[PDB]
Amino acid sequence: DRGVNTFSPEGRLFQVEYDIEAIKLGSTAIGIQTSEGVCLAVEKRITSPLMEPSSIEKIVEIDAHIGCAMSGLIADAKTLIDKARVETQNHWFTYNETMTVESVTQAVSNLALQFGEEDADPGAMSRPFGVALLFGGVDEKGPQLFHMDPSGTFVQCDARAIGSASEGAQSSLQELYHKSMTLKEAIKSSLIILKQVMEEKLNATNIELATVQPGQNFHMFTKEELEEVIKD
Amino acid sequence: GYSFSLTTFSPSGKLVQIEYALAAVAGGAPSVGIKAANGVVLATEKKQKSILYDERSVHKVEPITKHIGLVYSGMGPDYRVLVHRARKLAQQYYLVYQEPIPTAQLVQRVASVMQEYTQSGGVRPFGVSLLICGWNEGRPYLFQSDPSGAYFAWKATAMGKNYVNGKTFLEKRYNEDLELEDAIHTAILTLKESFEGQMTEDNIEVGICNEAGFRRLTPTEVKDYLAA
Amino acid sequence: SIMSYNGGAVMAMKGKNCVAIAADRRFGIQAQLVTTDFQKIFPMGDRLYIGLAGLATDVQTVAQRLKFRLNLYELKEGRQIKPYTLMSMVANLLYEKRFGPYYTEPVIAGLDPKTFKPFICSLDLIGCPMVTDDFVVSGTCAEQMYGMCESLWEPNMDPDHLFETISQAMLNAVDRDAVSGMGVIVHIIEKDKITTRTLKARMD
Amino acid sequence: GTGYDLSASTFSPDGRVFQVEYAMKAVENSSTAIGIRCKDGVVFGVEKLVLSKLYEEGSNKRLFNVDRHVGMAVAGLLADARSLADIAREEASNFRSNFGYNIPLKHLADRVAMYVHAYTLYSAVRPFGCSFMLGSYSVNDGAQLYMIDPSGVSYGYWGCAIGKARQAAKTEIEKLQMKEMTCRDIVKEVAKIIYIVHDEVKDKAFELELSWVGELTNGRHEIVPKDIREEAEKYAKESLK
Amino acid sequence: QYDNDVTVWSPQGRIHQIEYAMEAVKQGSATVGLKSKTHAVLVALKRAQAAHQKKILHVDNHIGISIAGLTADARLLCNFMRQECLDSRFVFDRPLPVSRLVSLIGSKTQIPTQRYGRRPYGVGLLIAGYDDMGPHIFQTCPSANYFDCRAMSIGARSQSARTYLERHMSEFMECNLNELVKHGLRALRETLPAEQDLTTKNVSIGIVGKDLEFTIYDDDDVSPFLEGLEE
Amino acid sequence: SRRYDSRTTIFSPEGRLYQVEYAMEAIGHAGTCLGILANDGVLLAAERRNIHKLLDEVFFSEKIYKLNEDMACSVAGITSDANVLTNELRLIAQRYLLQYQEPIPCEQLVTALCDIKQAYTQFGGKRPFGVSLLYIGWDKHYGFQLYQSDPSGNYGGWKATCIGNNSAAAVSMLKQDYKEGEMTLKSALALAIKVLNKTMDVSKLSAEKVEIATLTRENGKTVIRVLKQKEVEQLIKKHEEEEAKA
Amino acid sequence: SYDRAITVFSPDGHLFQVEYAQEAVKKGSTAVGVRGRDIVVLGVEKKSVAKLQDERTVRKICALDDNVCMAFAGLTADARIVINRARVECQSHRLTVEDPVTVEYITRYIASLKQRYTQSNGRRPFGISALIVGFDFDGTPRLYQTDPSGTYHAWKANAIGRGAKSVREFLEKNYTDEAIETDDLTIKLVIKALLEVVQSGGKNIELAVMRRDQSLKILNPEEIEKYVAEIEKEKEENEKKK
Amino acid sequence: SSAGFDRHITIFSPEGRLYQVEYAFKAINQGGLTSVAVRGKDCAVIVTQKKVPDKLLDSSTVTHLFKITENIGCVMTGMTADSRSQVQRARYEAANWKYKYGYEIPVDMLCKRIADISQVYTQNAEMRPLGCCMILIGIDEEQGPQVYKCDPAGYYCGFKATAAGVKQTESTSFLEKKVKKKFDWTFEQTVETAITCLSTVLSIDFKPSEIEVGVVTVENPKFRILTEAEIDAHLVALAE
Numbered sequence A: 001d002r003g004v005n006t007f008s009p010e011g012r013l014f015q016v017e018y019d020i021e022a023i024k025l026g027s028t029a030i031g032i033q034t035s036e037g038v039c040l041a042v043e044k045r046i047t048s049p050l051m052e053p054s055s056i057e058k059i060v061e062i063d064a065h066i067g068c069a070m071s072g073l074i075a076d077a078k079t080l081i082d083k084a085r086v087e088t089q090n091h092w093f094t095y096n097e098t099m100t101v102e103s104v105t106q107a108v109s110n111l112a113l114q115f116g117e118e119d120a121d122p123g124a125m126s127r128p129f130g131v132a133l134l135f136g137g138v139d140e141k142g143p144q145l146f147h148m149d150p151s152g153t154f155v156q157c158d159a160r161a162i163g164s165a166s167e168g169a170q171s172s173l174q175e176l177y178h179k180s181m182t183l184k185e186a187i188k189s190s191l192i193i194l195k196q197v198m199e200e201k202l203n204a205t206n207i208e209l210a211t212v213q214p215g216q217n218f219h220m221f222t223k224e225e226l227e228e229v230i231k232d
Numbered sequence B: 001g002y003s004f005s006l007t008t009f010s011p012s013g014k015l016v017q018i019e020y021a022l023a024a025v026a027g028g029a030p031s032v033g034i035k036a037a038n039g040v041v042l043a044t045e046k047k048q049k050s051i052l053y054d055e056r057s058v059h060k061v062e063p064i065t066k067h068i069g070l071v072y073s074g075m076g077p078d079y080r081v082l083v084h085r086a087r088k089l090a091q092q093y094y095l096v097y098q099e100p101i102p103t104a105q106l107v108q109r110v111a112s113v114m115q116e117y118t119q120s121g122g123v124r125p126f127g128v129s130l131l132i133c134g135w136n137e138g139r140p141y142l143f144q145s146d147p148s149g150a151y152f153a154w155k156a157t158a159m160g161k162n163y164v165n166g167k168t169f170l171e172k173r174y175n176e177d178l179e180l181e182d183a184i185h186t187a188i189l190t191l192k193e194s195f196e197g198q199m200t201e202d203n204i205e206v207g208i209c210n211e212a213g214f215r216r217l218t219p220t221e222v223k224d225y226l227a228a
Numbered sequence C: 001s002i003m004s005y006n007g008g009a010v011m012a013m014k015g016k017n018c019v020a021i022a023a024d025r026r027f028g029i030q031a032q033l034v035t036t037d038f039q040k041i042f043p044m045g046d047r048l049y050i051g052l053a054g055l056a057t058d059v060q061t062v063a064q065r066l067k068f069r070l071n072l073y074e075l076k077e078g079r080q081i082k083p084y085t086l087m088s089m090v091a092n093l094l095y096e097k098r099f100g101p102y103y104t105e106p107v108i109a110g111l112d113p114k115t116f117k118p119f120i121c122s123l124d125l126i127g128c129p130m131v132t133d134d135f136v137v138s139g140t141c142a143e144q145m146y147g148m149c150e151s152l153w154e155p156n157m158d159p160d161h162l163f164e165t166i167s168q169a170m171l172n173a174v175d176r177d178a179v180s181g182m183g184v185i186v187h188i189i190e191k192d193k194i195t196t197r198t199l200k201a202r203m204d
Numbered sequence D: 001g002t003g004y005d006l007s008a009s010t011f012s013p014d015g016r017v018f019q020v021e022y023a024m025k026a027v028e029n030s031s032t033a034i035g036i037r038c039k040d041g042v043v044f045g046v047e048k049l050v051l052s053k054l055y056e057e058g059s060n061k062r063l064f065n066v067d068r069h070v071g072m073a074v075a076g077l078l079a080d081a082r083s084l085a086d087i088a089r090e091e092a093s094n095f096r097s098n099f100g101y102n103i104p105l106k107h108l109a110d111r112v113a114m115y116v117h118a119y120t121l122y123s124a125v126r127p128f129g130c131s132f133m134l135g136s137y138s139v140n141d142g143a144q145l146y147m148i149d150p151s152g153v154s155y156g157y158w159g160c161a162i163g164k165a166r167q168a169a170k171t172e173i174e175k176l177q178m179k180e181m182t183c184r185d186i187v188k189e190v191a192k193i194i195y196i197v198h199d200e201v202k203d204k205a206f207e208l209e210l211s212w213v214g215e216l217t218n219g220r221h222e223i224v225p226k227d228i229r230e231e232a233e234k235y236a237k238e239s240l241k
Numbered sequence E: 001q002y003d004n005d006v007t008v009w010s011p012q013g014r015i016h017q018i019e020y021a022m023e024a025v026k027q028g029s030a031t032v033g034l035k036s037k038t039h040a041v042l043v044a045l046k047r048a049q050a051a052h053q054k055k056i057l058h059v060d061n062h063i064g065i066s067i068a069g070l071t072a073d074a075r076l077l078c079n080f081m082r083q084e085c086l087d088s089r090f091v092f093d094r095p096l097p098v099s100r101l102v103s104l105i106g107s108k109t110q111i112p113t114q115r116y117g118r119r120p121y122g123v124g125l126l127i128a129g130y131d132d133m134g135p136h137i138f139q140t141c142p143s144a145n146y147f148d149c150r151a152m153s154i155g156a157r158s159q160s161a162r163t164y165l166e167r168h169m170s171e172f173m174e175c176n177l178n179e180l181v182k183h184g185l186r187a188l189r190e191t192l193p194a195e196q197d198l199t200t201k202n203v204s205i206g207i208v209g210k211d212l213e214f215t216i217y218d219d220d221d222v223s224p225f226l227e228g229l230e231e
Numbered sequence F: 001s002r003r004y005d006s007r008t009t010i011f012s013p014e015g016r017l018y019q020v021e022y023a024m025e026a027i028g029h030a031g032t033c034l035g036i037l038a039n040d041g042v043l044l045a046a047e048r049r050n051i052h053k054l055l056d057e058v059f060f061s062e063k064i065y066k067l068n069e070d071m072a073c074s075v076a077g078i079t080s081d082a083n084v085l086t087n088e089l090r091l092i093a094q095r096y097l098l099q100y101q102e103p104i105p106c107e108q109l110v111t112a113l114c115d116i117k118q119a120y121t122q123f124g125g126k127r128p129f130g131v132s133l134l135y136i137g138w139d140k141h142y143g144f145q146l147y148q149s150d151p152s153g154n155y156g157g158w159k160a161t162c163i164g165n166n167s168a169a170a171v172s173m174l175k176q177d178y179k180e181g182e183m184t185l186k187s188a189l190a191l192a193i194k195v196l197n198k199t200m201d202v203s204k205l206s207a208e209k210v211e212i213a214t215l216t217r218e219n220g221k222t223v224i225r226v227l228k229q230k231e232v233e234q235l236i237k238k239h240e241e242e243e244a245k246a
Numbered sequence G: 001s002y003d004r005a006i007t008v009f010s011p012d013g014h015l016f017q018v019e020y021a022q023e024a025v026k027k028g029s030t031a032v033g034v035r036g037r038d039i040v041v042l043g044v045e046k047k048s049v050a051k052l053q054d055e056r057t058v059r060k061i062c063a064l065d066d067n068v069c070m071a072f073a074g075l076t077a078d079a080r081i082v083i084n085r086a087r088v089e090c091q092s093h094r095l096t097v098e099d100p101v102t103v104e105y106i107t108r109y110i111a112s113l114k115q116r117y118t119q120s121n122g123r124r125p126f127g128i129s130a131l132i133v134g135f136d137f138d139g140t141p142r143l144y145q146t147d148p149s150g151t152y153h154a155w156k157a158n159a160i161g162r163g164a165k166s167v168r169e170f171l172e173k174n175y176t177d178e179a180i181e182t183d184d185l186t187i188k189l190v191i192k193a194l195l196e197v198v199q200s201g202g203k204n205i206e207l208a209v210m211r212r213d214q215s216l217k218i219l220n221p222e223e224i225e226k227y228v229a230e231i232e233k234e235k236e237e238n239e240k241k242k
Numbered sequence H: 001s002s003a004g005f006d007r008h009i010t011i012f013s014p015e016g017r018l019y020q021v022e023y024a025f026k027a028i029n030q031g032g033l034t035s036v037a038v039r040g041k042d043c044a045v046i047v048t049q050k051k052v053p054d055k056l057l058d059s060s061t062v063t064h065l066f067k068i069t070e071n072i073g074c075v076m077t078g079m080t081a082d083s084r085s086q087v088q089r090a091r092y093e094a095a096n097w098k099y100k101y102g103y104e105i106p107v108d109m110l111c112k113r114i115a116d117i118s119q120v121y122t123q124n125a126e127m128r129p130l131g132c133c134m135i136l137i138g139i140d141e142e143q144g145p146q147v148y149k150c151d152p153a154g155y156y157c158g159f160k161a162t163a164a165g166v167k168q169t170e171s172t173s174f175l176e177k178k179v180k181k182k183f184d185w186t187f188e189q190t191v192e193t194a195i196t197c198l199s200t201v202l203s204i205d206f207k208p209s210e211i212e213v214g215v216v217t218v219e220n221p222k223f224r225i226l227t228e229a230e231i232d233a234h235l236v237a238l239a240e
Helices: A014-019 A074-095 A101-109 A169-175 A183-197 A224-230 B016-022 B080-097 B103-116 B167-171 B182-192 B219-226 C056-076 C083-095 C143-149 C159-174 D018-027 D078-098 D105-117 D166-173 D187-197 D226-239 E016-022 E071-091 E099-108 E159-167 E177-188 F018-027 F079-100 F106-114 F167-174 F185-199 F229-244 G016-024 G076-096 G103-116 G164-171 G183-197 G221-241 H019-024 H082-101 H107-120 H168-175 H188-202 H228-238
Strands: A029-034 A037-043 A059-063 A066-072 A131-138 A143-148 A159-162 A207-211 B031-035 B040-045 B131-136 B139-145 B157-159 B204-210 B213-216 C009-014 C019-024 C033-035 C041-043 C048-051 C107-110 C119-122 C135-139 C184-189 C194-198 D035-037 D041-048 D063-067 D070-073 D132-136 D144-148 D154-156 D207-210 E031-034 E039-042 E056-060 E063-067 E125-131 E134-140 E146-148 E151-154 E205-209 E212-217 F033-038 F041-046 F071-073 F134-139 F143-148 F160-163 F211-218 F221-226 G031-035 G040-042 G061-063 G068-071 G133-135 G141-143 G208-210 H034-039 H043-048 H065-069 H072-075 H134-139 H145-150 H156-158 H161-165 H213-217
Touching: A029 A066, A029 A131, A029 A143, A029 A169, A029 A183, A037 A066, A037 A131, A037 A143, A037 A183, A059 A074, A059 A131, A059 A207, A066 A074, A074 A101, A074 A131, A074 G103, A101 A131, A101 A143, A131 A159, A143 A159, A159 A169, A169 A183, A183 A207, A183 A224, B031 B131, B031 B139, B031 B157, B031 B182, B040 B131, B040 B139, B040 B182, B080 B103, B080 C083, B080 H107, B103 B131, B103 B139, B103 F079, B131 B204, B139 B157, B157 B167, B167 B182, B182 B204, B182 B219, B204 B219, C009 C107, C009 C119, C009 C143, C009 C159, C019 C048, C019 C107, C019 C159, C041 C056, C048 C083, C056 C083, C056 F079, C083 C107, C083 C119, C119 C135, C135 C143, C143 C159, C159 C184, D035 D132, D035 D144, D041 D070, D041 D132, D041 D187, D063 D078, D070 D078, D078 D105, D078 E099, D105 D132, D105 D144, D105 D154, D105 H082, D166 D187, D187 D207, D187 D226, D207 D226, E031 E039, E031 E063, E031 E125, E031 E177, E039 E125, E039 E134, E039 E177, E056 E071, E056 E212, E063 E071, E063 E205, E063 E212, E071 E099, E099 E134, E099 E146, E125 E205, E134 E151, E151 E159, E159 E177, E177 E205, F033 F134, F033 F143, F033 F185, F041 F134, F041 F143, F041 F185, F071 F079, F079 F106, F106 F134, F106 F143, F106 G076, F134 F211, F143 F160, F160 F167, F167 F185, F185 F211, F185 F229, G031 G141, G031 G183, G040 G133, G040 G183, G068 G076, G076 G103, G133 G208, G164 G183, G183 G221, H034 H134, H034 H145, H034 H168, H034 H188, H043 H072, H043 H134, H043 H145, H043 H188, H065 H082, H072 H082, H072 H213, H082 H107, H082 H134, H107 H134, H107 H145, H107 H156, H134 H213, H145 H161, H161 H168, H168 H188, H188 H213, H188 H228
Parallel strands: none
Antiparallel strands: A029 A037, A029 A159, A037 A207, A059 A066, A066 A131, A131 A143, B031 B040, B040 B204, B131 B139, B204 B213, C009 C019, C009 C135, C019 C184, C041 C048, C048 C107, C107 C119, C184 C194, D035 D041, D041 D207, D063 D070, D070 D132, D132 D144, D144 D154, E031 E151, E039 E205, E056 E063, E063 E125, E125 E134, E134 E146, E205 E212, F033 F041, F033 F160, F041 F211, F071 F134, F134 F143, F211 F221, G031 G040, G040 G208, G061 G068, G068 G133, G133 G141, H034 H043, H034 H161, H043 H213, H065 H072, H072 H134, H134 H145, H145 H156
16 A cells, blocks of 8 residues: 555656546536637536426626636635635735735645645545646736645646546647737637537526626626527 | 554454464463352462472462452463552542442453453454452352463363363262362362372462452462362 | 632431431522522442532542542452542542642531441541541531530430431531521431431421 | 565664665765864864856855864765754753853753654654764863764764765774874874865865864864865875875 | 555665655656756756646756656745745844755755654756855755765666766866756757657756855747757 | 455445345344234244253343333344344434434334445444344334344334244245234234244254344333243144134 | 545446445336326335335335425435434524525525535444435426435436336326326326336235325325226226237 | 554554564664673672773773662663663652652662663553663662563563573573572672683673672662772682
8 A cells, every 4th residue: 555645766756546437537628718708618517308407507706706626526626715715805905905916816725735644634635636626816016826735836827728528629729829919809719619529508597607807896697698609 | 662463353254363362361361160068269379390499479369359369371470460459449449439349340350451461552462261259248259361362160170281181070070068178179180180290389379269368378278179 | 708609518328237318409509599409318239328418510420530540440350349448439439630620518427338337427628637436517507516516415316216206407507507407417327228208308 | 585684673684674675875975074082182174076167166065064163074965964053052042041060061962862863763754864073172171073974873983984984994094193282283184185185086076174173273273274184285296295 | 564554674775665656757858967167957858748847846946856757746846945934034034055055955854764654755956056166066865865966967867867977077167057958958869769859849957056045947948058069 | 456356335237235235144144033913913923043051031131122122133143233223223212302302213223224334334434234124113103013124224114024944934924814903913924923933943942042022012011022932832822722623 | 533435436437335325226216207287196015015014114205394295215224324313404494584495495505415425534424325306496396316425306206216217118108198188197197107016916015195285195005006997997907909 | 473553563463462562672782792790698790791802992981880779789681772761760750769768779679660661662652662671780678689670562570590691591591500509798808709600601601891789788888880900809719
């Protein structure tokens, strides 16, 4: 047998290298930024024609100006999201201002490699979270997007896809980006990418879409605010 | 400290470490305990393996209080622990009720401990089965505990190395109306069948429980009795 | 004080082969009646009774904890308890709280279920047992019963004289106290029977 | 499998704590730190193997100052060595604070050894990998020298050569009479030994490190003056010829 | 098997877990740092893979760091250093030196190498600072062993830079600031697969001295130090 | 400290725990026990194993116990582990009395125990308890109550049960010869003496390899009584005669 | 204390303890739930009746509060613990907030409890998959579901336990608006569904029904037999039609 | 026989043995030393064996004899790092006894406590039993001389003459030949016979530099080791 904080003959922890293979089984999500806001789209991966699709919450709100998409194990995420929220509020409590997305992502990453049997484990943490997050929000310096792995190495990006088929779709998303691209073109591109990568179909129910454009707060697209653009 | 049990259920449903401990008392310096109306008798056997060894320094029959005795069959080092624990519980009972503790309660608590040392963190079962005598409200009492935590109220039992051949010998001789003079003869003669070589006093220890207090007999008495 | 916040009185005597115990049955708060059927005498086994006086909440708390321990004792090994053992148990129970104590003054009365030898005892706020052959007293009207039982009691007493003795003393001792009275309850024990009685008292 | 060597809380049938026998194999792979005692004090000596021409002279020091009158010369893993050094400093401070005077050497060595010994019994730790030395001088006691191993032993000595070249330095110090020599006709002999023992085939180059304690310094533990070191190196290079 | 735990010496006195951790430093982006007579410099590579993470941090006005291992565990040591320096300033009112700080950091890292269920920190560090005795360059490895060097570098294929420096060793202590910068940048240039040249979107440089408090330069302020290259 | 553990609490590949279903394998080799409820009482029978020159009749009994004024148990597994569960039950009942000043219903007392050995299957690292039981009692809400328990915190009420060696044959022969609400305490003992010698491996009962207890209510009070050798002798003789009637 | 890693990842993510806990549910007792227009139905079944058992004691339909009910399809010892914790939390919530709980609240609570035991040291995951149902304020019947991993989704008609695959396949082709019109109709669906996994007819059924402000109900075998005979007559008529 | 982890920790095997202690008992024979102790009417003597292969070593810190208290002695055998721990423990226990009870501590209670501790290890697994012995001498007021011993299994007994180390068998075999025709052993028959035993066991013609002796006599109870001038006397005496 082996332990949880054991290295391999490559400088690679074991539990993390094993968990990263879990996200290759989850659904896909795409996040994009521009000069006038960001965009987050996600898939639902329905199974049966009896589940209420309005119960699948994959795009949540951290605050009025931050968002989040998640992939992998939807359960392990519920422990991090709350934390983020808490942190944000405490900031507003002590400094009467809004938290940066860099700060939020850093505070969340600080909780990734806290696991082991030595300590009394009051937090009981025994293994890493298998999830991949995708934040996004406005700040003091324009809009920002970020990416997080289960190892706590967040890095800023411009347009990123995560999930099962986030290998070839990243190429297509690598072609269709220009600094002066607008929001509408980005949304259409992400939608057509999800269409080509998805299996069943593209309905206004099997997707979640959100924006954090400046001036406004976090927003989720309605069932009627979606189909008006899918008519391509 | 380790926190997990080392005694565990086997596929057949039996705890195996308990059996392996019960195989230790097999070699345990045979002992004997007999019951009569005027008291009770306990008798051990010693195995001094040299003349250089001493005799008036090591004692197997150790008292608990003024009316309760004790003897063992197995691991010596694991017997003083129980002696000390019992001498503590007796004093606790006294301090609480201001009255000597009866025998059955003592056996109960000792067995509770011998069982608590069966599914705790990083320990093993003991390697001894005790035999304890007492006197209460005008009646004797003899009890035998096991490494598993179970105690029976026996009547002229035996344990040690040749117990299967010591209880059948003890069945065909217990009249149940004996005095505290020939029960000692029976005790001696029983282990006399499980003794190699010439017997004497220094190779034997005895104790009795009459209505005056638990006592240990000095070599003079054992010699007087050894004369038939 | 705090002890006299409510009020109480209890007494016990000894005879030839029968003992007795008595108490008052008032409940009030420092000047005022609330009810006249308060219980202070509890049976701890057969042929063995205990009476408490002082603070009522501590009265009940002690009764309950004592029943707890006594039931566990009886179940562990099957024997009706002896009086001296009960005295020692109450001593321990009251001394465990030397700092932050209760405010009850117990009184025990019973026999021995091997010779029917009578026995009575009185403890204190912290467990100072005082065995007496004459009698025992506990409450706020103590000096009004000491001088009363020291003038009537005699060594050997028949049950009827024992009942006529403890009653007059108790009544004429509470009739000179204001925070105790409004009824009297008596229990007489015997080798094979028990008799419980209530007397005629003044309700002023 | 066997599993007789994967823990300290395990005796081999013959009777051996193999983990300590393993840890004491690191010392056999490190460089030498001989040290010898005279009529006036103690004198250490160490060779530092420069691995690359980038490091500076004065790094990876193997000579520590534990107290005003006590020094340490180590061999093996240096992290454990620094840990033990701060342990010893702590002990001496607490002592001087409780009793009110400078701690002797016997007591300090016994305490440190009983500390390092607590690691050869349990399965929650591993034995150390460093064997170290200690030396002091006083007016009441005099010269004192001691050595400690990874198992928790502590014996006196006239001169020890803990490290890789043990037998060689031992048999080269035996040809000496320091009990008759003072604290100046000695350093040059230390240098001669350190030079005659080391080889230039398996290793390229090295650097010397010395220490001092006794009457020349009046109790204090200090580095050797540069002129004395130069004289010593000159004699050593003249005799090696 | 003597490889799965950190409390098992091998028959030849080798703790395999510490070596396996060390093998995590020879996979990250390379970093370099050399010393002069008055200043201290640090550089990096920022291997983008199309964005990547930063590779230099700030500890205090006179001390800075460069990391080449696991980014999660490096923030821990960074916090440790910041708090130690804050404490030394709060109590004594004086900038904490570099030697005592590196000694503290070394002690902090030795414990988990001596007990159960723990793992050693898998990050190497380059430290640059300045105090009364001049500048100082320090190196730190997973094992609690710290050196004091005139020039060093860490990461993959860092042997070529080491050789180039050993050949150019006897040239520092008199060069100016920009000369030091050019020397370092042309030393780093050898850790590439002869198919790429150093640019502005890769290099990040920090500089400290007796007249400046560890200034960092981003991709938009590195261009001034690129002129003067060859093949 | 990892190559010496069995982890003691692990879902097997098929979704089953192993230690529990093992202890259940030893439970089936302990003292046969049987329990019946009748319109006017509740009876509990048991079989003994020790027959030697022992100091019998020293205590109230060897397999039957007591928990309060109106309850009793008939544990049929390992004795050492059982000597503590009785203590736990007594503690529980006395705490309930201390708080609510009323006798404890039986279902509460069964649940508060079936929760104590559930943790031993989830937390800790300890081997669980290896005893199944049979509780009898009386309460003012449902009247007479007989209940069961199992090593993994699992319980269920019944009309008539048997556990221990050869419990299945008894449960089979018993679900036919039991009239619903057409039973008394005079025929229940007869059916008990019947199934016990129809199940026990001995040719016949000597009234010394058996034990019986009855719980009833007589003039408000509740009586839990064991039968003397003479009563059981009369019972076995009447059973012999009744069988002779065929 | 016990601080050891019980559940851990694998070369494919594949947390093994959960994959195993999910196998017990595949052999437990079938359960069915339905969310009608103004009624909710629970038809737990697969009961092994022995004729000598008090039906009260072993039930498997439990009330956490006047608003909420529940059913489970696995180990019972753990289900009892879960239900007790949930009742405690329902009362605490009714205490702090001056209004009763909502289905989603307690479902999320149970899910967090299930997930905590897939990450904590010394703890072992639960082995139950519940089936909650309730009536939120303003009516709005609600049926949810849960797994030992910590997930939960709102279903219209879902089934668990053994034989739940056939039940789902049969239900997805029969649940229709024109089929759900009255209280008597919602129930017939559950009986027709359970008739498949059923072994020997309507001898093993513990139907219930939650309506607006009844707070619970359980049926006696009389109406069960009546409904069974009605279903038999409908089947005979349909067969005559074919 | 064997099954499972019965050789790597303190647990019972099928036959009923604890193999770990049977293994630890072989640790004493590692150091390759030996020791003995005897007593007579008013004395108690303990002798050992000294060795020094190297010449660069202060022959003043190399000693197996220690001072538990002004009236008690002790000799150790086997390992050299676990014995010092036992010595410190004994000293602490004795001082605590005198601080709590008001009078000195006898030998019996000391041996008892040491054996209790040394046994605590034969039950738990996290720790291992120490490889060492402990053999004490002390004078009392009633019984007089007292010799006691301890092994790494929890046992403790009183003796008239005992030996320990690697040659314990032959030593005790030779010792149990003189006690038969015992005689008045005042002062010169205890040291002489001890050294005679050691010589007849090793047959090396000892010299006055490779032995240490400790004596306690009713006349002067205090522990005292010896001076080489004394050993020279006895050696020139019995060498006739």
